[model samples]
Target chain A: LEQVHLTEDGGVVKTILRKGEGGEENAPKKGNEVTVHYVGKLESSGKVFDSSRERNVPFKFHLGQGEVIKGWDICVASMTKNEKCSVRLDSKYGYGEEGCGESIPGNSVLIFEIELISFRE
Target chain B: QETLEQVHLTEDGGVVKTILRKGEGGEENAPKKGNEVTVHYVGKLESSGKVFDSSRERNVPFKFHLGQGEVIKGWDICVASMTKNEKCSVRLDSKYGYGEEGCGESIPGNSVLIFEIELISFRE
Candidate 1:
């Protein structure tokens, strides 16, 4: 369950759903390669817009590379191996004013359940 | 009506099923109505051998409720019969894949389609 009220302006918030494996030393760094699975749901409609879990494969990307949404970069960077978190994103941390396709609306807040599979430097 | 790459999935033969990798168990555990099924797939145009939609490339497995119209008719038919870990290459008649309306720019109207699907898992 998420608190939903701890949000800072233009930033991201996370609620840990399941604890991960390994210790802090196993966590990722700014430029480390990370692997995760995610399910993105539109906050307003509660519909899943995207999900790597559905694809049956983990998603791999470099941390802090701007390859993904700002919230993911911010929130996932804090994750350790095997940790699962339900993250909340302010519009700015998400698609913002421009929105994204037909699923996400402009200025709409979003929520995602993210599971950090692993990471490497 | 049958080959390693050309097995029939339906009585009429509009949908063909060929197992690339046999799944676990048998018909008793096959997918059925109201089950949420997860699968990885790649779609292609039979006419030009060009690729279209692919959940594999996107690194997102597609999921839908069994027996619902959440996907193509042929997909529903084929996936309903699949067991966990079943991987198959299916051929769909136009009526089954996209019908005469086809889809966006990738699939032309009345075109046959080929899809390689891996049924990863399912839950009722």
Candidate 2:
């Protein structure tokens, strides 16, 4: 029953599909190192643009930093360790008009299935 | 505590590998010609140590096939000598680094590159 809009502008929509251990107390804060597994998809076409699982590598990043997409930082910040969620992002929160590489197009809304594996201070 | 003095220099002297932290496995625990490897790194200019690019800052570890021309020649040689979990700082001459063309704005032409790298994991 825990679903929230990560941003005040509603650019990011986060829905918690599965609750994780430790709850919000265990969530990663700003500047904390975090590891995750994710699959990125195009909203309209549902085509996968990137997947850590396929590559057999888990991604690591500092939470709340500009290291990743805006939507990713916002959504991940709201999750707890081992939480699994699906986040839908508006283009502004994603790649915007410039898009990313060939896989993501301009103004494309994006979807990401993210699992917060772990975090450390 | 190993120092930069003990770091190995390739035969051609185009590359220098300085061990910051040694890996768990011994000398033989390194990536082969075709093994895939993942690493985190901070790239800087050797003259000034100004960070030009970094996978650490980006919060993403870079991965590539070993000795496949996927990266610079110096990187291939340096990584082949590194074991999993090994952290090292490598100094590359222009010939082994970016060469005459160099890279974009962050890097200048004929610049010597210094990279502090951590070999997080690897697989064949």
Candidate 3:
């Protein structure tokens, strides 16, 4: 497991599970459309924040694109097929101080429970 | 100087912490500049002592880097202070924590964080 610190208050922590395991490695050299099942939650209250299992359909995105955060772009692009892992991203690599509308708030460390479901060429 | 006590952060943030200790393998387990590692972790709220996230449920591990700013300032400092197989708890604030936007259904704005992490393995 890889650990990285993001704050001086010692409030946020990030762990990378199954290194280089997220999107697809062969779909595109620079980018690829990736599908994944994700579950997000709060590290404080143990409350579930977001979950794809509720949607039934996994989410899809273009790996390596700015559409996602820096951590997701770097983390997801390194994944392969059927890979499961979680990424704890601090606000720095995430939404910065301003979060993504109702889904994510400002400065909140984003927790991603992701399973690399499939890839499309 | 408050002895750096009292962890702060939001409930929405992701956290992973571990204990601090020396390794028996010495340099063999030291973290490199650019190496990928696998790890297991548990996250909780420092104030409430409530568990928020855990990989132990799925029997998996988390991977990431030290001092790369991929995570929070708290985590960056904690991981950088440990050796391979070392662990410790990390805390964060809102400014350094979650500014105000908040996420999903949990982790409100300007919240604090707590993480329990373990160094599983590292290297390309």
Candidate 4:
């Protein structure tokens, strides 16, 4: 339905579920540590693959340093504080041909419902 | 057991520690000066709520020799004060942290730092 094509080739697609407060000025820059809560699913079947919400441990990472997957860097870079979005990542932007362990299958397209919690100043 | 009580580790208050959760052992089980300590920590700037660094994010527990100068001044002191499985938060004045020069980029000069540290294990 309403999806924003993050890349020309449709490598990444994003849908804003709820627009959060703050401006792009407040967005996380490269090298800043960011904390988020997310639910990962197999885009094809809509089955849950992982969840930080279940663990109650907010996932933290250093933005744009390759500490996370390629899709996360592209997606979070465009998000501001409190912004909630559902991102669909093509395999090239996700785990690619190898995917991730037994959870994510090879060449699997991934969907992540995520929220930007906070980032270091 | 509820409200966090901060303890000044030094006379000038350069380092302060607060126990968030009680550890498995008591003071007698505290790590020795040369013991190898394993820990997971999340560092932040006191002035801002931003996180500067985190070992938990990488899912890797850090290892260092206690009182060996392998880490920041505040860590060696605060960690040594803990027993195994003890989780605490330590606040470090600039002097006890990266100092006036700071650690480049993420941490600024003369910045006050706070870290939530958990003592996973230690060995001689």
Best by the DockQ measure? 3
Better of 1 and 4 by TM-score: 4
Error of 2 at A8 (Å): 1.7
Q: How do the residues A5-36 of candidate 4 rate in per-residue lDDT, one tens digit apiece?
A: 88888988989998878686779998888999
The pairs that clash in candidate 2 are none
RMSD of 4: 15.3
Minimum summed lDDT over a 10-residue window in model 3 chain A is located at: A21-30
Q: Per-residue CA lDDT of candidate 4, range B7-124, in tens? A: 8998989999999988986756789998878899999999996897888876667777799664788999899888888899899998888765565345666789999999999898
Candidate 2 residues lying further than 4 Å off, grouped into runs, are: A22-24, B1-124
Instruction: TM-score for candidate 4, please give it.
Output: 0.52
**Which candidate, 1 or 4, has the higher lDDT?**
4
Q: What lDDT score goes with residue B10 in model 1?
A: 81
- On the 0 to 100 scale, the lDDT of residue A107 in model 2 is 77
Measured over all alpha carbons after superposition, the RMSD of each candidate to the real structure, in angstroms, is: 9.1, 7.4, 15.4, 15.3
- Candidate 3 docking DockQ: 0.14
DockQ of every predicted complex: 0.04, 0.04, 0.14, 0.02
Q: Over the stretch A35-75, how does candidate 2's per-residue lDDT look in tens digits?
A: 99999999999999889898677877788766677888889
TM-score of 3: 0.44
- Per-model CA lDDT versus the true structure: 0.79, 0.82, 0.58, 0.84
The digit string of per-residue lDDT tens for model 2 on B1-124 reads 5345546567776798888888977645777898989999999998877897788876767787888665788899888888989999898988887676555445566788999989998898
Rank the models by DockQ, top first.
3, 1, 2, 4
